[PDB]
Design an enzyme around this catalytic site. Structure first.
Site, short mmCIF file in Angstrom:
data_model
loop_
_atom_site.label_atom_id
_atom_site.label_comp_id
_atom_site.label_asym_id
_atom_site.label_seq_id
_atom_site.Cartn_x
_atom_site.Cartn_y
_atom_site.Cartn_z
CG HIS A 40 1.78 10.13 -1.68
ND1 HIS A 40 0.89 9.37 -0.98
CD2 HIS A 40 2.58 10.79 -0.81
CE1 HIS A 40 1.15 9.60 0.29
NE2 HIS A 40 2.16 10.46 0.43
CD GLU A 71 3.94 13.76 -2.73
OE1 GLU A 71 2.75 13.65 -2.35
OE2 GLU A 71 4.35 13.29 -3.81
N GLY A 145 -0.95 4.71 7.09
CA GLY A 145 -2.21 5.08 7.74
C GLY A 145 -2.17 6.49 8.31
CB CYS A 147 -0.56 9.66 4.34
SG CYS A 147 1.15 9.14 4.08
C1 LIG Z 1 1.12 7.38 3.99
C2 LIG Z 1 0.38 6.74 2.81
C3 LIG Z 1 0.01 5.30 3.08
O1 LIG Z 1 -0.22 4.84 4.17
O2 LIG Z 1 -0.07 4.61 1.95
C4 LIG Z 1 -0.92 3.40 1.97
C5 LIG Z 1 -0.13 2.22 2.42
C6 LIG Z 1 2.54 6.81 4.07
C7 LIG Z 1 3.20 6.98 5.43
C8 LIG Z 1 4.61 6.33 5.48
C9 LIG Z 1 4.69 4.81 5.20
C10 LIG Z 1 5.88 4.35 6.07
N1 LIG Z 1 5.89 5.32 7.15
C11 LIG Z 1 5.25 6.46 6.86
O3 LIG Z 1 5.21 7.48 7.55
N2 LIG Z 1 3.39 7.39 3.04
C12 LIG Z 1 3.99 6.68 2.07
O4 LIG Z 1 3.94 5.44 2.00
C13 LIG Z 1 4.80 7.52 1.09
C14 LIG Z 1 4.09 7.63 -0.25
C15 LIG Z 1 4.66 6.45 -1.07
C16 LIG Z 1 4.35 6.66 -2.54
C17 LIG Z 1 3.33 5.92 -3.14
C18 LIG Z 1 3.03 6.11 -4.49
C19 LIG Z 1 3.69 7.07 -5.23
C20 LIG Z 1 4.68 7.83 -4.63
C21 LIG Z 1 5.01 7.62 -3.30
C22 LIG Z 1 6.14 6.48 -0.67
N3 LIG Z 1 6.07 6.87 0.75
C23 LIG Z 1 7.01 6.70 1.71
O5 LIG Z 1 6.83 7.04 2.87
C24 LIG Z 1 8.29 5.97 1.31
N4 LIG Z 1 9.38 6.49 2.13
C25 LIG Z 1 10.41 7.13 1.56
O6 LIG Z 1 10.61 7.17 0.34
C26 LIG Z 1 11.34 7.80 2.51
C27 LIG Z 1 12.47 8.56 2.18
C28 LIG Z 1 12.90 9.05 3.35
C29 LIG Z 1 14.03 9.94 3.73
O7 LIG Z 1 12.05 8.71 4.34
N5 LIG Z 1 11.02 7.90 3.79
C30 LIG Z 1 8.12 4.44 1.39
C31 LIG Z 1 7.81 3.93 2.78
C32 LIG Z 1 9.30 3.70 0.76
#
Ligand SMILES: *[C@@H](CC(=O)OCC)[C@H](C[C@@H]1CCNC1=O)NC(=O)[C@@H]1C[C@@H](c2ccccc2)CN1C(=O)[C@@H](NC(=O)c1cc(C)on1)C(C)C
Length: 180
Positions: A40, A71, A145, A147
């Site tokens: 992502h 991913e 932050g 990721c």
């Molecule tokens: C790391 C990326 C980041 O910080 O992005 C810049 C703001 C994120 C860490 C997450 C955020 C909340 N807590 C965390 O651990 N990762 C994300 O935000 C990922 C990636 C995005 C995304 C963006 C663009 C395209 C595709 C996907 C979605 N996401 C999520 O973590 C989501 N969570 C879920 O969908 C989800 C489902 C389940 C079982 O648990 N979480 C979003 C927070 C909605």
């Protein structure tokens, strides 16, 4: 002490900050010029590696046999440095792991280690509505932050952090067969 020490060695020898147009990520250097980031992050033809614009020679978004995204994105970088080879730490199979840590570099002033507790092989989830396979789950309120954060135990590099919902956190699994 030693659990944190192994993580700080992974940060020292095997991490970098990767910047794409979508933000900053902890990048895990696996071997040679190969780094992994969450898919992502959507890396382009160039990325920044510790602030230096670097051409991406090859990029692979990994999928399972059924065509579900994992991913994990592998990038081969155009630069001189070779990462310490950590393929020996990557598991061959999916499993559960007690008492894991996340090693974080990007989006904070200094590298740190967070104990995320027990981890389970969780299967598939819907990440922003899109099915994602081979998730490793932990009960920790990970945030934006985190990721790319490296999920590990001593001698075991397990995955990279990709998502969370404010209660649980999820890493994309790393398996040894993802590399030759
Ligand atoms: C790391 C990326 C980041 O910080 O992005 C810049 C703001 C994120 C860490 C997450 C955020 C909340 N807590 C965390 O651990 N990762 C994300 O935000 C990922 C990636 C995005 C995304 C963006 C663009 C395209 C595709 C996907 C979605 N996401 C999520 O973590 C989501 N969570 C879920 O969908 C989800 C489902 C389940 C079982 O648990 N979480 C979003 C927070 C909605």
């Amino acid at each position: 002490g030693p659990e944190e020490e192994f993580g700080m060695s992974l940060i020292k020898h095997n991490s970098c900050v990767i910047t794409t147009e979508n933000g900053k990520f902890t990048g895990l250097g696996v071997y040679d010029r190969f780094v992994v980031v969450p898919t992502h992050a959507d890396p382009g033809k160039e990325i920044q590696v510790d602030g230096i614009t670097t051409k991406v020679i090859d990029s692979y978004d990994l999928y399972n046999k059924n065509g579900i995204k994992l991913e994990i994105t592998v990038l081969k970088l155009d630069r001189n440095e070779k990462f310490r080879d950590i393929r020996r730490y990557i598991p061959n199979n999916e499993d559960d792991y007690p008492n894991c840590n996340l090693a974080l570099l990007a989006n904070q002033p200094e590298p740190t280690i967070i104990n995320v507790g027990d981890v389970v092989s969780y299967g598939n989830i819907l990440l922003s509505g899109n099915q994602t396979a081979r998730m490793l789950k932990y009960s920790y309120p990970t945030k934006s932050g985190y990721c790319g954060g490296v999920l590990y135990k001593i001698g075991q590099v397990l995955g990279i952090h990709v998502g969370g919902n404010g209660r649980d956190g999820f890493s994309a699994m790393l398996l040894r067969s993802y590399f030759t």
